[PDB]
Amino acid sequence: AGYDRHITIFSPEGRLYQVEYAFKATNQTNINSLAVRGKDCTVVISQKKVPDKLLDPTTVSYIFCISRTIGMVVNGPIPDARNAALRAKAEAAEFRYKYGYDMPCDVLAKRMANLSQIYTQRAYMRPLGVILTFVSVDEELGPSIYKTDPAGYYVGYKATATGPKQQEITTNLENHFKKSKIDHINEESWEKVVEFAITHMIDALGTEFSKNDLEVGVATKDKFFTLSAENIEERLVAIAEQD
Amino acid sequence: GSRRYDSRTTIFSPEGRLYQVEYALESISHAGTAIGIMASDGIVLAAERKVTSTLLEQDTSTEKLYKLNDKIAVAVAGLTADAEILINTARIHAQNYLKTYNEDIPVEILVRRLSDIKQGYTQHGGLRPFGVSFIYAGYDDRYGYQLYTSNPSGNYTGWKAISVGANTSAAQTLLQMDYKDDMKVDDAIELALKTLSKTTDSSALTYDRLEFATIRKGANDGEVYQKIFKPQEIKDILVKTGIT
Amino acid sequence: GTGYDLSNSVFSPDGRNFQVEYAVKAVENGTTSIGIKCNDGVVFAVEKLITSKLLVPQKNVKIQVVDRHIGCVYSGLIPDGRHLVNRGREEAASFKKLYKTPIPIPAFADRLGQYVQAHTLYNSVRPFGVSTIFGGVDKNGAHLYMLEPSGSYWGYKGAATGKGRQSAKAELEKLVDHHPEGLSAREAVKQAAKIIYLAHEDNKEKDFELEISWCSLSETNGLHKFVKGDLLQEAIDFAQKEIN
Amino acid sequence: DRGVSTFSPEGRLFQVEYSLEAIKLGSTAIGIATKEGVVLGVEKRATSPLLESDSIEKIVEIDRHIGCAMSGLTADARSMIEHARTAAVTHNLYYDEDINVESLTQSVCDLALRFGEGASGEERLMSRPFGVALLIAGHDADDGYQLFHAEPSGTFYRYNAKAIGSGSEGAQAELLNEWHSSLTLKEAELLVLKILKQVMEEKLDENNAQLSCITKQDGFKIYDNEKTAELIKELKEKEAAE
Amino acid sequence: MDIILGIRVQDSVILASSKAVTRGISVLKDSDDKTRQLSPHTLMSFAGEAGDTVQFAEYIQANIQLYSIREDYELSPQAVSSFVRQELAKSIRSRRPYQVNVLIGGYDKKKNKPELYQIDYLGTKVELPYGAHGYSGFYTFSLLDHHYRPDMTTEEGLDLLKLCVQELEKRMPMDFKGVIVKIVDKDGIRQVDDFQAQ
Amino acid sequence: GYDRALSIFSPDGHIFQVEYALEAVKRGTCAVGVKGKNCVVLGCERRSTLKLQDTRITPSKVSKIDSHVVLSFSGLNADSRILIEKARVEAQSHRLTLEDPVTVEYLTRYVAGVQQRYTQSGGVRPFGVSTLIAGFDPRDDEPKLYQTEPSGIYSSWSAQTIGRNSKTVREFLEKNYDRKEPPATVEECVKLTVRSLLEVVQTGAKNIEITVVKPDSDIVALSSEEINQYVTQIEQEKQEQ
Amino acid sequence: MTDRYSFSLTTFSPSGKLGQIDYALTAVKQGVTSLGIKATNGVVIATEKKSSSPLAMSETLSKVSLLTPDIGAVYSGMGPDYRVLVDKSRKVAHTSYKRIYGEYPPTKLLVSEVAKIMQEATQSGGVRPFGVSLLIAGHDEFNGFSLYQVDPSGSYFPWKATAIGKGSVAAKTFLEKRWNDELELEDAIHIALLTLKESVEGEFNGDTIELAIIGDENPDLLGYTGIPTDKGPRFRKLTSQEINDRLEAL
Amino acid sequence: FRNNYDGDTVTFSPTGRLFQVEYALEAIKQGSVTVGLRSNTHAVLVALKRNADELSSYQKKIIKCDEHMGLSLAGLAPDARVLSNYLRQQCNYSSLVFNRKLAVERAGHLLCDKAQKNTQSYGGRPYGVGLLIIGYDKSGAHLLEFQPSGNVTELYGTAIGARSQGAKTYLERTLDTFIKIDGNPDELIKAGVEAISQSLRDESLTVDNLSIAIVGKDTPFTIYDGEAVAKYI
Known part of the structure; x- marks a missing residue:
C-alpha cells in the first residue's frame, strides 16, 4: 500500500509522488536559468556556480550543444542532465539520418517529453530529475524555446525561466512583455538580446554578476554556440555603461 | 529489487481459495445483471445496462451482448474492456476451427478454450485475472441449444436457466421457481424480463436499460438465427409482456 | 512516510537517492587517494594500508591503466573499482576500433559517467561504491577527473577522496594558490607523495605503502607509467622529510 | 518478501536450512558399507492400511553398480534419479566404462544449488532447493564399495554407515557403536533391520520396511519381501538369544 | 509409385x-x-x-485419436480430410515438405453416406466417386469412367476393383505384389482377406 | 517473464503453497475408487450449492485419458482440465513411439511429475488437485488404482477416497474392504462403492455417479436408475435390522 | 537492469475494486473540463486551453487532435498520457486498418483500438493505467456521425453529448437541458460554448478555448485536386477568430 | 537497522555496508581452518579436513586448478567447486589460446571480478567461501587470499577458517624464517603444519585428518592425503 510512493503508480488521489519528488531534484543545483527570443536569435542564460577551488571551471556547465542547431540548458543534477544530453544528441543524429533534415527544436522536445512520459508509466524506470530547455532558430518556426519536465509535459514559450527563483524571473519577464506588447526582444543583434537577458536576470534576482557567474548559449540561423568568459565580460561591460 | 511490489496474483489462501478470483467475483457481483434461459425451440439472453443517461446513445451501444459466431453469442457481466479482449480471441478461435475442419465450432469446445485462457491467469504469469463472467448461448448439431457460464476461475457449467452479475441469488430463486423443461422461446423471453424486473436496483425497467437477444431456428428455413433486438424491439416486447 | 532508502532508484520526498548517498559512505570509509594535474600531465597517488607484515610489499597494485594513456585510482569497494575499469577498457577499445585514435580524456570521462549514472536508474542494481580519480594526456592537453557514485564528475586541478580527503584537499588548495603558473610532473610526483603522507594521519594507526603513477607529455611521452625505484624513493623521502 | 537465495546473519542459506527441516520429517533410510558390499534399508511408512505398500519405491537403481535410497519430499527425488541414470548411462556411452560412484554423486549434487529467481552465475531455473536427501551406494574398481550422503546444500559426504530421516539422530548413534571395519554383508543386513526397528513407530515387518544391497558380483538388487522376512525372523532370534 | x-x-x-x-x-x-x-x-x-x-x-x-478422446466424438470424414489437407498445405511451404499422397475413405454416420477424398502432398483436395495416386490413375480413371455406376453394391465395387487391379497387373511395368483391400461402411472398417483370387 | 518463487520452504520445512493446494482438495467434492478382482470402480459425489443444471452438457467428474484408463479428481475443476489434457496427449504420444498404450502406473507417474514440477518452478502455483487413476494395463486383467496429490506424490491403493469427508469414507473402506477377498463381482464392487459414498452424500440418487472399468477398454457409466437401484437395496440392508 | 516488473500493478482488492483504475479516474476528475456534442450534421468537441504561464504559447499545445481526417480526440486528465495515446492511436489506425483495407477506420473501431491499448495498461505487467478519459468524435460512411468516451479502464460508450473532468457533473446537467435530436452543427457549437463558459474562471475567448468539429468535407484542406472521390477531411479545428465571432452571438 | 538492509546484495546500509556479503564472509569463519605460506622456490597449502561423524569422511579442501596452480577452501564447498572450475577453465584458455601458463596474479584478478558480479546484482547471492591460492609461475612462488567480497590479496603466508587467527599470528612471527625455506619442501610443509596446529583446540591433526598440497620450481601442484602426510604429524 505505502509503496505507491516508491514507484510510479497512482496514489488514492491520482497523484504520482515519484514524479513530484523528481521535480524537487531539479532545484538541487540551486541554479537559475532563463531563455528569451530575439528577432532572429534565441538566448539562454544560466548562473554558473563553482564553489570548489580544486575544480576546473571550464568543465562545469549545464548548457549543451545537442546538434549544429539545437541547444539545451538543464536544471537539475549533472548526471541525469548528461544522460538527457547524450540521448538528445543520439536522437537528433538519428532523425537527420532517417528523415533527411535537421530535427526541429519542438520535435526533439516532444520526443524527450515522450521518453519522460514513459518513465512516468513503467515501474522499472525512474524519472530523470531534470527540466530541459531547448532552443534554436527553427527553419520553419523561427526562434524557439521548448521545455520539458519529469512529468512528460512540454510546451513552447515566448520566454521562460527555471530554478529556485523561477517565479521572480518569470513575473519580471511577464511584466516586460505586458509592456512591450510583442512576444520577443525586438533587437537585431544577439549581443543586445543577450544583454537584455542578463539585465533582467539581475533585476529579478537583485544580484550583480562577474564574467564567471554566468553561462550563455546563443542560437542563430543554422548555428547554436555558447559564449566565452570574455565574450560575456564584454556583455557585462556594455550593460554597465547604461546604469 | 522488484519482489517488494509483487502482489502475487496467483497464490492460495490458507483455506485453499484464490484471492484474485474471489475478489474478481466480488467485482462481478456489482455488474448489471445478465440472464440466460434455454427453451425447446430457442435460447434467450437478456441483460440490464448498468448506469445510463439521457445523452447515452443506445442505438449505437452494446455493453453486454456480443456475437461470437453466427451460432454463438455471449452475455457479459464485469469489466467491458476485459470482456472485449476475451471476446476477440474467442472469435479467432472459432474461425481457426472452421478453417481447420470446415465445420462450425461445437459450442462446448469454444467455451472450454475461453475458460482455459482464464484458468491460466489463475496459475501462472503473475497478472490479474479478467474481471468477467460470461453466459454463452449457442447451437450445434450435436447438443442443439446450449447454455453455459464461465467466470474468473476458468470453471464452466451448463444450465437451463442462469444469471450472472448483481442479485443472482434472488434471480436464481425466481428462475428456479417458474422455469419448466417444456418452455418455449416466447415463454422464456417473458420469464427473463419478469426476473430482471424483480431484481433490478432501479425504479422501473425501461427499454433504454436493456439488451435482448434470441437464438431460434426459424421454422420457415431450417437454419439457426441470432437476433440482437433493437431499441424499439425491446420497447415492444416490454409492453406486450405487461411491463409497458 | 519512510523506506525511501531501501530501493536504489527511488526519489525521497526531498528529491534525493539515498542508496547513492549510502554508497558514498562506503567511499569515505576507504583508503585515501588523489590526483594532481601538472603543466603537461597528471599524477596519481594512493594510500595502501599494510594490514600485516604478510602482505608482499609492492605486489597488490591499486592504480590501473586504461588503454595506454589513462590512469585510474579509486577509494571505496575495490572490486567495484575494478568492475568500472574493465568497463572503461571495453569502452576505450570500442572507441579506438571505430575512430582509430585513442579515446580523448573528456570522452572517456563521460563513458564512465554514463555507465555509473546508469547504475542509479534501477532497483535491480546497486550504485558503485567508489569515487574514481582518473585522467591522462590527449590531442589537447592533460585532464584530471573525479567521478562520484552518483555518476557526477567534473574536470579538476587537483582531487582527493577517501578517509583523508579533507587533509588532501586542503593541501591541494595550497598548491593551487601557490602555483598559478603550474606545477611540473617532477614536482607533482613529490607533492603527491607528501599529501598522501599528510593525509595518512586520519589512519595513522596502521602502517602503509605509497603508490604513485603519472602520465606526462615530456616525462613519459604521454603514456601512463608507474613511478618506481629511484624516482619513487626520492619522493618518499621528500615526504618523510616534510612530515617533520 | 525475501530472496530464495538469501544468506542469514550466521552465513547460512535460509532455503537450504529450511530444506533440511523437511528432510527431518521424512521416513528413515539407513546405509551400511562393508568390504562385502553396501546395504540400503528404508522405512516404507504407508499412511493407511489400504495403501499397497509395495508401490512405495524409496530405494531405486541408478545403474547396475549404483543404488539409491531417499528421505524427505520423495517426489522431489524423481528428477534427481533421472539425472543420475542419464549421467551414468551417458558416461558409459562416452567412455566405454562405468561411472565412478563419487563422480555420479558429484553430478547429482551439481543440481542442488541450481535454484533462484535469477542468480548471476548461469541459468538456475528451479524455484527452490530439493526437499529430499539421498544415500547413494555403489561399487567401482578404484575405490570399492562406497556410501555417500547427498544433501540439498550440494555437499556430499562419504560414510561407513549413515542414517537420514526422522530417526536419524537416534539411529546414527546406534551405527556409531555397531559399525566396524570388518562387518560382513549379513551382519550389515541384520544391523540395518535392527536399527530401523528401533526408530520406526510401527512394528517392523517385511511390508513396512525394505532392504537392498549392491555387490561387485551381482550389482544392485532390491530384496523381495520373502527374503527380508527371513532376515527379520533371524534377527528376532539373535536378539532373544541374549 | 505404389498403387493407391x-x-x-x-x-x-x-x-x-x-x-x-x-x-x-x-x-x-x-x-x-x-x-x-x-x-x-x-x-x-x-x-x-x-x-x-x-x-x-x-x-x-x-x-x-486425441480429438476422439478429448471430445468423446468421432469427427466426420469431411472434417478429418480438411484437417489432413491443412497439414499438407502447411508442409508444402515448410523446410522439408511431407512428400505423401493420400486417399481418405470414410463413412459419415450422420449423413449415412460413404465419402472418398483424394489429397496430394501439395494439399490439393477433391471429393470423388473414385480416385487414384501415381501412375495408376492413368489406366484406372478411364476404366472406371466406363464401368462405374453410382448405385453399385459393395460386391459390385469389389468386382470393379478387380477389373482395375487386373489392368494394372497387365500394363504397369512394376510388380506391385497385389493389393490389400479394405471396406469402410456404416459398420466400420474390415479387410477383405480374400482378394488374392476373388 | 514472471518467475517469482511461489512454492518455497518455511522455517518448519513446509511448502505452504503445496499445503494450501491440499486444502483446495479437501474442499472439493468427494471421489472414491475401489478395485474388485476383475474391475475397478470410480464414484464421485455431486454438489448441490445450485441445482438447475443441464446434466447432459455439464462436464462429468470421471474422465477417460485413453480407452483403457480413467481419471477422477477432487479440487479445482479448472486445474484438473489442464492435467487431463496433458495426460491425454502423453497417452497418444506413448502409443505413437512405443507402439503400445500406457500402463496405469506410467500414466500416473506422468501426471504426478507434472504436479511435482509445478511445485518447484518459478511463476506458477501448484495444482489444487488430487487424482485417482484407474484402468487395466494393455493385455492385462489385473486391476489398477493410483492416487496423485499436489506435491507430486503417487501410490496404488486397494481402495482410496479424496475430497471433503474423505476421512469418513476412508474409515468405512478400511473396515469394509478385505484384501483377502476383494469384491469378486462388478456388482458387489459397485455396491461397496455406493455404500461408502452414502456415508457422506446424505441421500443423493442424483448426487452420486459411478463408472465401471473392466479389462480391454471396457468402460461404462451407470445411469441414475442403475445407481438409484443400488441405493435402494442398501437402505433395506439397514432397515432389515 | 531489464524490466523485472512482469506482474500486474493493478489488482483486485477484497471489495472488488481495481484501485489503480479508480485512482486514475480521480486524476481525470482534477483535469480541465472538456465536452462533446453531436448534431445532426456534425459533432463538436471542446476544452479550455489552461495555459500554465502567460509566457507559454498556448497554441503550441493542442488538447484537440486529429486522429484520421474524419476523427478527432480531446481529453481530461494527464496531458502527457494523452499525447502518447494520440501518437499510438494515429498509428494503430494505419497498421491495423488503413494498410489492410486501404481506407481509414470507422470511428467505433478506432475507438475500440484505443480502448484496447488502455485496457492493457490495466493488466500488463509493470505499468499503471493511463490517467485520462478521452472524447472521440468522428464520421464514417456507414455509421454517420458519432461521439465516444473512453475511460482509464478501457471501457467506452457512445454519447449524444457529454462532459468529462473538473465540472463534468454540472456541465452534463446543462447539456441535458439544451440537447435535442434536431440540433444543427452551429447550434451545438453554440451550446458547447455556453457550457464551457460555466467551467472557465478567467478569460473566455478564441485564444483560451480550443474547439474542433467533424462536419462537411473540406476540399480546401485536401492539398490537391483531380480526384473526384477525394473531397477532403471532415475534421476541422476552429480558428481563434472563428471562435470569437460566435462568442459575440453568445 | 541491519534487518532492513540485509535482505539482498543490492542494498547499501546507512553506513555503506553490504550485509549479505558480510553474512557470506561469516560462512568462511565457520569453516574449518586452512593455511598457506611460500618461500621463493615453493608454496604450500595445509588444510584441516572436517568430518560429520566418525563414520563419515573428512571433506577434501584442496583443489588442483592446473599443473602450476591450486587452492584451499573454507566455507561452502559447492561454491569452491564453481570458482575452482572457473579457474580451471581460465588456466585452460590461457594454455590453449596463448600457450602460456596463467599468472597467479591474473588468476586472482579473474576471481575477484567473478565474485564482484554477484554483489551488485539482484537475484544472485555472494559466494560463501574463502580461498587460498598457491602457484609457481614466471615470477616464482605465489600465495593469494580470496574473500567472497571479491577482495584478493597476495601474501607470504596466511590462514582462514575457524581459529585461523592463531596460525596467522604465528606466520606473521615466523615470517623471516620460512620465507627463506628455499630448496627444501619438507621444511616448508613442516613450517606449515606448525602454523596450522596453532589453530587447533578440539583435537590434533591425524593421518586421515590432515591435507597438504605443494607446488614449486620443479614440483607440479600435487596433493598429499593420509599415509602421505603421516611423516609430518
Whole structure:
C-alpha cells in the first residue's frame, strides 16, 4: 500500500509522488536559468556556480550543444542532465539520418517529453530529475524555446525561466512583455538580446554578476554556440555603461 | 529489487481459495445483471445496462451482448474492456476451427478454450485475472441449444436457466421457481424480463436499460438465427409482456 | 512516510537517492587517494594500508591503466573499482576500433559517467561504491577527473577522496594558490607523495605503502607509467622529510 | 518478501536450512558399507492400511553398480534419479566404462544449488532447493564399495554407515557403536533391520520396511519381501538369544 | 509409385493398396499395408517418399485419436480430410515438405453416406466417386469412367476393383505384389482377406 | 517473464503453497475408487450449492485419458482440465513411439511429475488437485488404482477416497474392504462403492455417479436408475435390522 | 537492469475494486473540463486551453487532435498520457486498418483500438493505467456521425453529448437541458460554448478555448485536386477568430 | 537497522555496508581452518579436513586448478567447486589460446571480478567461501587470499577458517624464517603444519585428518592425503 510512493503508480488521489519528488531534484543545483527570443536569435542564460577551488571551471556547465542547431540548458543534477544530453544528441543524429533534415527544436522536445512520459508509466524506470530547455532558430518556426519536465509535459514559450527563483524571473519577464506588447526582444543583434537577458536576470534576482557567474548559449540561423568568459565580460561591460 | 511490489496474483489462501478470483467475483457481483434461459425451440439472453443517461446513445451501444459466431453469442457481466479482449480471441478461435475442419465450432469446445485462457491467469504469469463472467448461448448439431457460464476461475457449467452479475441469488430463486423443461422461446423471453424486473436496483425497467437477444431456428428455413433486438424491439416486447 | 532508502532508484520526498548517498559512505570509509594535474600531465597517488607484515610489499597494485594513456585510482569497494575499469577498457577499445585514435580524456570521462549514472536508474542494481580519480594526456592537453557514485564528475586541478580527503584537499588548495603558473610532473610526483603522507594521519594507526603513477607529455611521452625505484624513493623521502 | 537465495546473519542459506527441516520429517533410510558390499534399508511408512505398500519405491537403481535410497519430499527425488541414470548411462556411452560412484554423486549434487529467481552465475531455473536427501551406494574398481550422503546444500559426504530421516539422530548413534571395519554383508543386513526397528513407530515387518544391497558380483538388487522376512525372523532370534 | 486406389459405391468406400515395398533392386516386403485407421469409420491410404509416408500417416492418426478422446466424438470424414489437407498445405511451404499422397475413405454416420477424398502432398483436395495416386490413375480413371455406376453394391465395387487391379497387373511395368483391400461402411472398417483370387 | 518463487520452504520445512493446494482438495467434492478382482470402480459425489443444471452438457467428474484408463479428481475443476489434457496427449504420444498404450502406473507417474514440477518452478502455483487413476494395463486383467496429490506424490491403493469427508469414507473402506477377498463381482464392487459414498452424500440418487472399468477398454457409466437401484437395496440392508 | 516488473500493478482488492483504475479516474476528475456534442450534421468537441504561464504559447499545445481526417480526440486528465495515446492511436489506425483495407477506420473501431491499448495498461505487467478519459468524435460512411468516451479502464460508450473532468457533473446537467435530436452543427457549437463558459474562471475567448468539429468535407484542406472521390477531411479545428465571432452571438 | 538492509546484495546500509556479503564472509569463519605460506622456490597449502561423524569422511579442501596452480577452501564447498572450475577453465584458455601458463596474479584478478558480479546484482547471492591460492609461475612462488567480497590479496603466508587467527599470528612471527625455506619442501610443509596446529583446540591433526598440497620450481601442484602426510604429524 505505502509503496505507491516508491514507484510510479497512482496514489488514492491520482497523484504520482515519484514524479513530484523528481521535480524537487531539479532545484538541487540551486541554479537559475532563463531563455528569451530575439528577432532572429534565441538566448539562454544560466548562473554558473563553482564553489570548489580544486575544480576546473571550464568543465562545469549545464548548457549543451545537442546538434549544429539545437541547444539545451538543464536544471537539475549533472548526471541525469548528461544522460538527457547524450540521448538528445543520439536522437537528433538519428532523425537527420532517417528523415533527411535537421530535427526541429519542438520535435526533439516532444520526443524527450515522450521518453519522460514513459518513465512516468513503467515501474522499472525512474524519472530523470531534470527540466530541459531547448532552443534554436527553427527553419520553419523561427526562434524557439521548448521545455520539458519529469512529468512528460512540454510546451513552447515566448520566454521562460527555471530554478529556485523561477517565479521572480518569470513575473519580471511577464511584466516586460505586458509592456512591450510583442512576444520577443525586438533587437537585431544577439549581443543586445543577450544583454537584455542578463539585465533582467539581475533585476529579478537583485544580484550583480562577474564574467564567471554566468553561462550563455546563443542560437542563430543554422548555428547554436555558447559564449566565452570574455565574450560575456564584454556583455557585462556594455550593460554597465547604461546604469 | 522488484519482489517488494509483487502482489502475487496467483497464490492460495490458507483455506485453499484464490484471492484474485474471489475478489474478481466480488467485482462481478456489482455488474448489471445478465440472464440466460434455454427453451425447446430457442435460447434467450437478456441483460440490464448498468448506469445510463439521457445523452447515452443506445442505438449505437452494446455493453453486454456480443456475437461470437453466427451460432454463438455471449452475455457479459464485469469489466467491458476485459470482456472485449476475451471476446476477440474467442472469435479467432472459432474461425481457426472452421478453417481447420470446415465445420462450425461445437459450442462446448469454444467455451472450454475461453475458460482455459482464464484458468491460466489463475496459475501462472503473475497478472490479474479478467474481471468477467460470461453466459454463452449457442447451437450445434450435436447438443442443439446450449447454455453455459464461465467466470474468473476458468470453471464452466451448463444450465437451463442462469444469471450472472448483481442479485443472482434472488434471480436464481425466481428462475428456479417458474422455469419448466417444456418452455418455449416466447415463454422464456417473458420469464427473463419478469426476473430482471424483480431484481433490478432501479425504479422501473425501461427499454433504454436493456439488451435482448434470441437464438431460434426459424421454422420457415431450417437454419439457426441470432437476433440482437433493437431499441424499439425491446420497447415492444416490454409492453406486450405487461411491463409497458 | 519512510523506506525511501531501501530501493536504489527511488526519489525521497526531498528529491534525493539515498542508496547513492549510502554508497558514498562506503567511499569515505576507504583508503585515501588523489590526483594532481601538472603543466603537461597528471599524477596519481594512493594510500595502501599494510594490514600485516604478510602482505608482499609492492605486489597488490591499486592504480590501473586504461588503454595506454589513462590512469585510474579509486577509494571505496575495490572490486567495484575494478568492475568500472574493465568497463572503461571495453569502452576505450570500442572507441579506438571505430575512430582509430585513442579515446580523448573528456570522452572517456563521460563513458564512465554514463555507465555509473546508469547504475542509479534501477532497483535491480546497486550504485558503485567508489569515487574514481582518473585522467591522462590527449590531442589537447592533460585532464584530471573525479567521478562520484552518483555518476557526477567534473574536470579538476587537483582531487582527493577517501578517509583523508579533507587533509588532501586542503593541501591541494595550497598548491593551487601557490602555483598559478603550474606545477611540473617532477614536482607533482613529490607533492603527491607528501599529501598522501599528510593525509595518512586520519589512519595513522596502521602502517602503509605509497603508490604513485603519472602520465606526462615530456616525462613519459604521454603514456601512463608507474613511478618506481629511484624516482619513487626520492619522493618518499621528500615526504618523510616534510612530515617533520 | 525475501530472496530464495538469501544468506542469514550466521552465513547460512535460509532455503537450504529450511530444506533440511523437511528432510527431518521424512521416513528413515539407513546405509551400511562393508568390504562385502553396501546395504540400503528404508522405512516404507504407508499412511493407511489400504495403501499397497509395495508401490512405495524409496530405494531405486541408478545403474547396475549404483543404488539409491531417499528421505524427505520423495517426489522431489524423481528428477534427481533421472539425472543420475542419464549421467551414468551417458558416461558409459562416452567412455566405454562405468561411472565412478563419487563422480555420479558429484553430478547429482551439481543440481542442488541450481535454484533462484535469477542468480548471476548461469541459468538456475528451479524455484527452490530439493526437499529430499539421498544415500547413494555403489561399487567401482578404484575405490570399492562406497556410501555417500547427498544433501540439498550440494555437499556430499562419504560414510561407513549413515542414517537420514526422522530417526536419524537416534539411529546414527546406534551405527556409531555397531559399525566396524570388518562387518560382513549379513551382519550389515541384520544391523540395518535392527536399527530401523528401533526408530520406526510401527512394528517392523517385511511390508513396512525394505532392504537392498549392491555387490561387485551381482550389482544392485532390491530384496523381495520373502527374503527380508527371513532376515527379520533371524534377527528376532539373535536378539532373544541374549 | 505404389498403387493407391479408392472407389465409393452405394453404401461404402473401398480402398485398394499395393503390398510391395521396393528399394533399388530389391522387393523388401510383399505384405505391406499402406493404410492407417484414423477413427472407427475413417481410413487413410498413402504413397510417396520412403520415410515420410508412415511418419505422416501415424502423426495424423495420433491427432484424430486425441480429438476422439478429448471430445468423446468421432469427427466426420469431411472434417478429418480438411484437417489432413491443412497439414499438407502447411508442409508444402515448410523446410522439408511431407512428400505423401493420400486417399481418405470414410463413412459419415450422420449423413449415412460413404465419402472418398483424394489429397496430394501439395494439399490439393477433391471429393470423388473414385480416385487414384501415381501412375495408376492413368489406366484406372478411364476404366472406371466406363464401368462405374453410382448405385453399385459393395460386391459390385469389389468386382470393379478387380477389373482395375487386373489392368494394372497387365500394363504397369512394376510388380506391385497385389493389393490389400479394405471396406469402410456404416459398420466400420474390415479387410477383405480374400482378394488374392476373388 | 514472471518467475517469482511461489512454492518455497518455511522455517518448519513446509511448502505452504503445496499445503494450501491440499486444502483446495479437501474442499472439493468427494471421489472414491475401489478395485474388485476383475474391475475397478470410480464414484464421485455431486454438489448441490445450485441445482438447475443441464446434466447432459455439464462436464462429468470421471474422465477417460485413453480407452483403457480413467481419471477422477477432487479440487479445482479448472486445474484438473489442464492435467487431463496433458495426460491425454502423453497417452497418444506413448502409443505413437512405443507402439503400445500406457500402463496405469506410467500414466500416473506422468501426471504426478507434472504436479511435482509445478511445485518447484518459478511463476506458477501448484495444482489444487488430487487424482485417482484407474484402468487395466494393455493385455492385462489385473486391476489398477493410483492416487496423485499436489506435491507430486503417487501410490496404488486397494481402495482410496479424496475430497471433503474423505476421512469418513476412508474409515468405512478400511473396515469394509478385505484384501483377502476383494469384491469378486462388478456388482458387489459397485455396491461397496455406493455404500461408502452414502456415508457422506446424505441421500443423493442424483448426487452420486459411478463408472465401471473392466479389462480391454471396457468402460461404462451407470445411469441414475442403475445407481438409484443400488441405493435402494442398501437402505433395506439397514432397515432389515 | 531489464524490466523485472512482469506482474500486474493493478489488482483486485477484497471489495472488488481495481484501485489503480479508480485512482486514475480521480486524476481525470482534477483535469480541465472538456465536452462533446453531436448534431445532426456534425459533432463538436471542446476544452479550455489552461495555459500554465502567460509566457507559454498556448497554441503550441493542442488538447484537440486529429486522429484520421474524419476523427478527432480531446481529453481530461494527464496531458502527457494523452499525447502518447494520440501518437499510438494515429498509428494503430494505419497498421491495423488503413494498410489492410486501404481506407481509414470507422470511428467505433478506432475507438475500440484505443480502448484496447488502455485496457492493457490495466493488466500488463509493470505499468499503471493511463490517467485520462478521452472524447472521440468522428464520421464514417456507414455509421454517420458519432461521439465516444473512453475511460482509464478501457471501457467506452457512445454519447449524444457529454462532459468529462473538473465540472463534468454540472456541465452534463446543462447539456441535458439544451440537447435535442434536431440540433444543427452551429447550434451545438453554440451550446458547447455556453457550457464551457460555466467551467472557465478567467478569460473566455478564441485564444483560451480550443474547439474542433467533424462536419462537411473540406476540399480546401485536401492539398490537391483531380480526384473526384477525394473531397477532403471532415475534421476541422476552429480558428481563434472563428471562435470569437460566435462568442459575440453568445 | 541491519534487518532492513540485509535482505539482498543490492542494498547499501546507512553506513555503506553490504550485509549479505558480510553474512557470506561469516560462512568462511565457520569453516574449518586452512593455511598457506611460500618461500621463493615453493608454496604450500595445509588444510584441516572436517568430518560429520566418525563414520563419515573428512571433506577434501584442496583443489588442483592446473599443473602450476591450486587452492584451499573454507566455507561452502559447492561454491569452491564453481570458482575452482572457473579457474580451471581460465588456466585452460590461457594454455590453449596463448600457450602460456596463467599468472597467479591474473588468476586472482579473474576471481575477484567473478565474485564482484554477484554483489551488485539482484537475484544472485555472494559466494560463501574463502580461498587460498598457491602457484609457481614466471615470477616464482605465489600465495593469494580470496574473500567472497571479491577482495584478493597476495601474501607470504596466511590462514582462514575457524581459529585461523592463531596460525596467522604465528606466520606473521615466523615470517623471516620460512620465507627463506628455499630448496627444501619438507621444511616448508613442516613450517606449515606448525602454523596450522596453532589453530587447533578440539583435537590434533591425524593421518586421515590432515591435507597438504605443494607446488614449486620443479614440483607440479600435487596433493598429499593420509599415509602421505603421516611423516609430518
